[PDB]
Every structure is written in C-alpha cells, then in structure tokens.
Amino acid sequence: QESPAFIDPASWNTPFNGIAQVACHNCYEKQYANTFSSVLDSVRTLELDFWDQRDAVSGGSPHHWFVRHNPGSGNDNNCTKNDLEACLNDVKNWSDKHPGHFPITLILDKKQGWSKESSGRTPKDFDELVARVFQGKLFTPQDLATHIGSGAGALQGNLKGKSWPTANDLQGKVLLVLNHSENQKLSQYAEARTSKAKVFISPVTNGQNDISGKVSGMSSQSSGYVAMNNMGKGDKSWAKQAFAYSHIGRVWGDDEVSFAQHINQKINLSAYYRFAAQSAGGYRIRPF
Ligand SMILES: [Ca+2]
C-alpha cells in the first residue's frame, strides 16, 4: 500500500464513494504540468481531452485519437506521437512503477462524436484500446455491479445505500470515466457496450433525473448504468445527491472554492487547474 504524504491514511479503509479528492482540470495541457506523468506526484485523478480528427474535419485514423484542447491541431499535450494511446501508456507505466497505488481515475473528455465501424473509432474500438493499454488494471461498471449484487444496467438506483470497494480493495486499479458536452454520446456508448463497458459514463447533471431517473439526453436503458455524475460550477449542489446515491461526483470550474469547502459540499472529485496548490490539512485525498 503506497503512502505519499498527500493521502490521508484513513482513506485506505474507506469506500471509494466516501473519499474526497483534488482532481486536475485538463492537466494534459503543457501549461498545467511539465509532463502528464508528473501530475501523479500530486493527485490520483487526471483528465484527457480527446479528438477523433487532427482538426475539426480531417486527419483521423482507425483505432487512434488525438489529445489537445482546441478543435484545431493534432496533439498538443504534455504526454510522452503523443496521442491518446501514448497518454494512457504514461498512466499505465506510472502504475507499473508504483505497485499498491491508490486507485487512479482518468476523466476521458470526448470532444467529437462516435464513428461508424468503417472508421475504427466506435465505442467497441475505444473499449478495445483502453483494454489493450491497461489490461487487468481496470475496474469497470460490471465490477462495481458485482460488488453490490446488482446488474450493471441497474447501478443507477441500486447504488443508493451501498458502498463501493475501499481504496485498499482498489489498490493498483485504474477507473476510466467518459464525459462529453452531450449526454447523447454517453447514451450511445452505453447502448453499444452494455455490461461489457470498460468505461464509466458520467453525464452532465443539472436535475434529479440526471442522478436517478431518465437522464437528460439519454435512454432509460443507458441511464441505468450511471454510477458517476459530472457537474459544472453552477450545478455543484447536485453533488450532495450524487453522494446520497453512491455515485462519484465531479465538479469542474470551481477553482476559487477550497478543497475543504468542496469536502463539506460532498464532492468526490474537485477539479482544479492548479491542483498542487490545493489541500486540506496537508492532504489532497481524504474521507469526507
Ligand atoms: Ca476537459
């Protein structure tokens, strides 16, 4: 079991959903970290923005995605061709070098739509990439479902009143999370992959239905897989309901509010551009 100073030792025996973290915001950008791997000197939750095309309209290849902030171009990031796969391998390699690590959560913020089969960037192609890179390191929705005695398609509601595995249980694990501006893209992913999904969907959340009902922009069937919720600053009040439902809540854009205050607001993952500057009682990871 690792013991960097930033992790409160009480975290290890706490269910993952009962742990608050400082997360990065867009830490693949050169301006926020010198290398992507260096982010793991400070936090255990990272973020990658990924594009199908080299710009908005051209330059994609099968089984490949780019990492950059703007529509464009190409790859513009601090990973070790520094594409999505390369960025993911930086995490995989850090994980191999730190047996016993606190579970790593990677927010995969998708910037374009899914392709059809011919172009090699479907939900299935995405799952195949992340599985090829991480292999057995992943902890997936079905793994959580089995832990709580639920079908994966009923995580949404069956998580209420339940504990995730503890950080100790999740030593050495990687959790992948899908974001997009449009919940439709998450619904498409879940409809394609169902219980085989390698990635947790985390919809944009601005009402109770996005936690526990038919999520805005999604089918009822896809809604049932929701075990995580994504909130901008204006919607962070919903983190208390994510918490109530044992969904992992992430709040982005709220940098002028301290980690301690976010803990009090029941936010699991508080995303900061300046992640190293944040702490509470010397810690960046602690139980609520
Ligand atoms: Ca992002």
DSSP state at residue 271: E
Backbone angles phi and psi of 10, in degrees to 5: -65, -15
Residue type at 172 in one-letter notation: G
State the resolution, in angstroms. Answer: 1.2
Backbone angles phi and psi of 227, in degrees to 5: -125, 5
Residues near 245 by beta carbon (within 8 Å), at least 6 away in sequence: 156, 157, 159, 160, 211, 212
Domain range summary for the chain, segments of one domain joined by +: 1-288
CA dihedral 219, 223, 224, 226 (to 10 degrees): 150
Alpha-carbon Rg of the chain, whole angstroms?
17
DSSP state at residue 39: G
Cα gap 45→43, rounded to integer Å: 6
Buried b (16+ CB within 10 A) or exposed e, 20-32: bbbbbbbbbbeeb
Cα gap 27→105, rounded to integer Å: 13
Residues whose Cβ atom is located within 5 A of ion ligand 1: 26, 49, 109
Are 211 and 230 in contact, with CB atoms under 8 Å apart?
no
Distance 29 CA to ligand 1 centre (A): 10
Cα gap 10→26, rounded to integer Å: 28
Distance 14 CA to ligand 1 centre (A): 28
Structure tokens at 57: 């309209």
Distance 49 CA to ligand 1 centre (A): 5
Distance 171 CA to ligand 1 centre (A): 26
What's the farthest any 2 CA atoms get from each other in the chain?
Answer: 52
Distance 21 CA to ligand 1 centre (A): 17
